[PDB]
Subunit: 311 residues, 6 copies
């Protein structure tokens, strides 16, 4: 119930070496030269310049994404946008450009092997169909390790741009994107604000027992194929290093979140769990009649919130 | 839902192989040969009597470590052998129970696990975005395509098995269903080690039609790919890549006796895609058609399978 | 699921228009002209920069008050303009976010809301029973049919927009998908105000085939109607009424450049019904065919849409 | 099972949501209705039945709407007892003439009123603004413009018309219906003293605030679709305010006639709790038939009850 | 197929040389059993109609049940034997029976062995798919519908023998399975004067199994999946041929009224047209474009009108 | 979708057995004894090496001829033996491949086919109407109920196997899943011939709860029955009949070591119905709980099964 959801705050599952793991990971990332590249890209828009932007990241993977900038003298405020799980079509260029038309230098980072970008990370062994369980038996090999770092590197690259006001950079996204937005804000102090639509990758131990649809269930499919009890124990150990309930505590930027009460993909409880772990200026928008989908009303909130803090 | 039986019997789509088809594989096999197998065996406890069970790994294309269980009849050989390939994302606990049962039928059996699926390592980089699944990983290039490494692993597997002392290299067979049947055929086409081939409704065949006739996963992964990459050239390049791995192009190299099965109401590996591969085989072959079965275990064909293998390898 | 492409490219069903087709509309436009627009603008706050947003209403057929958001680029014009029509029962919050984004692309945009759906008033009486939905309201007579008022509202909308000072009347376009695309085409056919037309898989086309080929709502609303009214004459009269609103009969009056899209696996607006309308257009036209898309947002066509509108209006 | 426990259902009695002007609203509505001349009309209608006369009956009602319906009377000297039958939501085919005629064959002068724009009848009421696909939310932002305002009055006027017939014993008139029909039967009995008995199969339009959170199928969910399209918080508040004027938990209190109701425990359309809520608000001779293994459908066993109950009170 | 093709679809009969002999013998075995009918008053909230429970002995000495409703007045009244759909009988469909009586017909709703009611003594030879469709399917002598068909015949014999029943005005009606029993009964007996069958089932079996999209025809497919032996399939269809309507229709000489919904997935239009096109008698088929395997209001008027004309 | 694991571990519904429970079976076993087994063996060709395969029939309750494949390790015995029972309407080609594989594991195995399902004759008359399926055949009386004959066939099967020379009567086991597991437990309860019992998510247990918790067939066959027979007494009598065959009433007679499995997301044999049976066992027992599996083949439990049988028989 809404009354219980408002109070649901599961106990962190972070291991003693939680922060050490990330400290090291950030370091390995730092050992890679960004070597960013910009390439003009033609698009039927007036008042905005569009480019294709790539840069080197963790494991020497080349990360892609479209970069749209308001066509005028800046520095303009900027946004790094993250897309949903297996939900990126044509690098979501139309969204990127529209954000630019709203006055934001925007870059839509494409998640490794999904919407685009290269993934050099080896596949240690078998796993369920999907990205959720690639290299899940070790925090070092897990899929989202590289992804999280790419999100951080993305901010480093954007911030370094001359036409970008480094003091007015925001991160936004829904589900997977919202999770990347929060993880990036937790692992970096570059973003000034965070907006996350029903964030994914949160409260994994409950998610696998409450979700009714993919992709959380990819973990269940994994356990079905690997009956060893130790596998389950090790898998959840790995996931704890990437769980939002453990990362939320490091977020110090103002955060705006949304949750649809009939969401079957990113269950309300998993989202409230992340929200209730945030120790910063925050606000959660609850929509009774919406699920894992585009919520018109929240779009107004999003625009208003970003405008207030960046525009 | 697919073609009638009269048309199916005559369906033989034009090969889509490019001029460099055989060259591509010739090079691929070479790169594979540049990797030392360095196989390893490790005893594995299992509640069976009369059979020895092991965990077997070996190095393959791109230096990937391939896994799989290896069961051998507990007695003096050399015993005939079988390399078994599992279905797409359909491997549970490395299918050990099946492996062991095959051994109990008198065969030295190895169930190779497909890269990143049932097990095994996949070192191959992911060039760029692709649809959820393995079907489109590195699909924009025959060199980077997922099944390139897999096919080679299948070949290397045979090289490893054959080299075993307790294995009669003249009585080695390859079996599998769907993805497994496709790997069985591809291995026989790329190697002369196997003496016989059994493939239950083979997958990875007649791609250009499959994407227009399949009603369920995983062929539709290709469709999802094109939805996310509207560029017309992408489609053209993707099918170019697939042609190098299509069974209608590999079948022609199979010279071993082949037994195949097809369920007429199969929605995953459409009858037409399977007949297409079959009609491209130029060797002793036989296709078992089951009117009331789909993409599933077909009891009646199991008898055929056993009988066929027994005749050519066992008795 | 539909008929081969090679056949689709040649599918051109025989018009079903009755002798009084054009007369019916001539009279309808007249009745509409007997109503004073009396438009109204009201500022509306929206978290956007560089665009002014308003709520716009005006009187139309049967004295119905029509609603819609109106967004204009915040700067000296006259700016080119677009009248956007939304899909069947597919309007949320008057689709304000789309309206505003169009304005941000440099177009004075008005998203007309279809009577009783996304908004707007519908004074038209309900003659008798009909299936759940709008598709069969007053279907037993062309005078009482639901889309009669809607079509006229679309026309009146253009009259209102065109009269605006910050709007260049020579650069006005109509766009929409499914129901919206049908309204865009119908408006261009009944008026000469719009310069260009863009229609994503248009609805309300080739009714007699649609009811035998569609796999999902809302075309099937007609089938539900016939199930509840077994009288043979009802079916005959219903299709007679529909003929006056069918795109295969209106397309012939469209003289503006038209851009259309169709997803080959569309179950709602079957490919054949869309090709039928397209093949009846006698004007500069182009149909974008997408093999792997259905009745949904097609990213690739969005580029075409922007490009086409930019070329003809910007 | 999916709703509240049977033990809890028997005690579920939600607090009325009626506003201070509840009874005033209806008092005025009945008055506006009275300002319209019925001007009924009868027209012979041919039907393959023996022993029954069938007619088409229309009459003027609220907003000057012409209401339709078939009228069947036992072919013999009366006055006969009479029934006004109301049909389910968008569930009327050919004006349900076969049911009408069968009721007449049971000895009842029967009239099946057709709900505005659904099974038949005219609806003059204007559509104030946008609303969800369906009738549930037409003019929902005001009790004066709400769809069921005209419908309820039509049901009342129907009774006035029937009662005035010479071949009808005004002291033996009943109202029956299921779901929407049962709701109209109860509403009519609450707003009129003409009917002697009421039978309602799992009544609809009851306990709206809970219904929208418990229903698993249409048409209650039309309200949810409405709120999805109109995010304004005030809209929700105003919509429920409007619904309260038509909610059975607020009208039941005015029912003084003997009432028979049925509820299927696995009903997903008219959830058991919404039905028990209406029943528990009735202050009159009543009886609720509970069927564990039935849902929103025809319940054979309750048909016997229905016939037996009507026969006892009217026959 | 298209309505144009459906109108001409007339599959070749599958009847074996001993077709008529099989039934001739079956009718004889039936005749060796004493009906010994029984009537028992049954209370029902109806006025103007008397209701009873009627049982009688049939093939294999099975006791057949059913409700019997008669107009409460001096007859003899015309009569109807109603057959219910496959596994579609609730409370012996008493409400329908009673309503028919209220329409002026002495009506008996025979309940099909083990389904809506009635006893089934026939042994189960061996394994078969879940359902009745394949019980004893490996032999025409042991097949489930053999006993059912005969019960339908015996039912007419019993009804006809009633004093309050005009034996020259007896009809048989039913939908799907019921319609199949109505036709089969008219083909195996000359007692009924008219036949009404809503989208008849048990027709054109060899095509039905390849065209049906839902149960219960698919029960045959389930059977073949569980019994891979090729001979099993051959023998099964051999058995079915003895009960197929395309082989029985030719013996129907009574006026017949049929209905078919073009979107029917249970009793595919082609299987129904196949039966219809094999009828050599006064007949008429009502085609409904927008209806499937369900109650069709418009056809109900036709049904009433047709029965009224020929019996009323 | 059931209760918590904490509650399941403690769920032990009150037995529903009637005073004449044990008397009913005592008589039933007697009637069975009045029938001469008259078993028959017939060689059957199968592409296997090291195993002999036969078709075995024998007479049982009501003089029904029961079938099944019989595979024996091709070597000098006596070998340990297994009687395998198949799932509800889940037998294809008499599951010969499984039978033969068991034999290859060293067990003389007989896969009894359940009356009218996988094979075997069912002479029992059908008293009256019932729902589509076997679950409610003759449900209005314990004497006429379908599973009465089936249970006895299971017992007679053990009598026949035990009597074989190549079979060590002190090492005979019964195994099965769902319906098969229910037959394995019932047989062990009605006979002292089997030394061990293995039952995968046993069916036919805790009927009164099952009908309110099951989400799929075949338990729901009972619900279909009550829908077609509204008489309140019917329901009462039906559950009375079922009580005589419910595992929660038979489990108490099982004295052999028992191994059971349950998938927590099982919708066919709900976890609670299986735990109810398990918690009524008063013998060496162990229940394997699988969180991510349902009514299906569970690889991990197969290892347990093999290991358990090997320990007690091989
Ligand atoms: O899913 C919904 C979509 O269908 C609609 O178009 O916009 C709002 C979304 O929530
Ligand atoms: O119970 C009835 C059944 O016997 C009949 O066949 O179909 C209608 C049902 O209501
Ligand atoms: O199937 C239809 C049913 O849903 C409706 O209620 O009554 C008419 C039938 O044809
Ligand atoms: O249902 C699963 C099946 O699909 C797989 O093949 O084997 C393991 C089972 O649990
Ligand atoms: Cl891993
Ligand atoms: Cl959702
Ligand atoms: Cl909401
Ligand atoms: Cl690629
Ligand atoms: Cl399939
Ligand atoms: Cl088959
Ligand atoms: Cl109308
Ligand atoms: Cl679609
Ligand atoms: Cl496409
Ligand atoms: Cl309103
Ligand atoms: Cl329901
Ligand atoms: Cl019930
Ligand atoms: Cl048989
Ligand atoms: Cl149907
Ligand atoms: Cl029709
Ligand atoms: Cl399950
Ligand atoms: Cl598990």
């Amino acid at each position: 119930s809404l009354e219980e959801l408002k109070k649901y705050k599961p106990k962190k599952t972070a291991r003693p070496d939680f922060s050490d793991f990330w400290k090291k990971s950030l370091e390995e990332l730092r050992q890679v030269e960004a070597e960013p590249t910009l390439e003009s890209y033609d698009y039927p828009v007036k008042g905005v310049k569009v480019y294709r932007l790539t840069y080197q990241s963790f494991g020497h993977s080349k990360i892609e994404g479209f970069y749209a900038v308001p066509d005028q003298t800046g520095p303009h405020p900027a946004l790094v946008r993250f897309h949903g799980y297996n939900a990126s079509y044509d690098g979501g260029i139309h969204d990127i450009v529209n954000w630019a038309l709203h006055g934001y230098a925007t870059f839509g980072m494409l998640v490794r092997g999904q919407g685009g970008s290269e993934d050099t990370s080896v596949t240690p062994g078998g796993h369920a169909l999907g990205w959720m369980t690639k290299g899940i038996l070790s925090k070092d090999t897990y899929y989202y390790r590289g992804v999280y770092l790419d999100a951080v590197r993305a901010l480093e690259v954007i911030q370094s741009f001359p036409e970008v006001d480094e003091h007015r950079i925001g991160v936004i996204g829904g589900a997977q994107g919202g999770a990347l937005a929060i993880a990036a804000a937790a692992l970096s102090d570059i973003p000034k604000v965070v907006v996350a639509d029903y964030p994914y990758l949160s409260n994994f131990e409950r998610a696998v027992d409450v979700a009714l649809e993919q992709p959380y269930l990819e973990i269940n499919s994994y356990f079905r194929r690997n009956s060893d009890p130790k596998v389950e124990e090790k898998a959840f150990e790995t996931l704890s290093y990437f769980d939002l309930i453990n990362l939320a505590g490091w977020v110090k930027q103002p955060t705006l979140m949304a949750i649809g009460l009939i969401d079957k993909i990113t269950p309300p409880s998993t989202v409230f769990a992340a929200y209730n772990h945030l120790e910063t200026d925050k606000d959660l928008k609850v929509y009774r009649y919406f699920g894992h989908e585009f919520i018109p009303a929240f779009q107004t909130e999003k625009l208003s919130f970003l405008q207030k803090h960046l525009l």
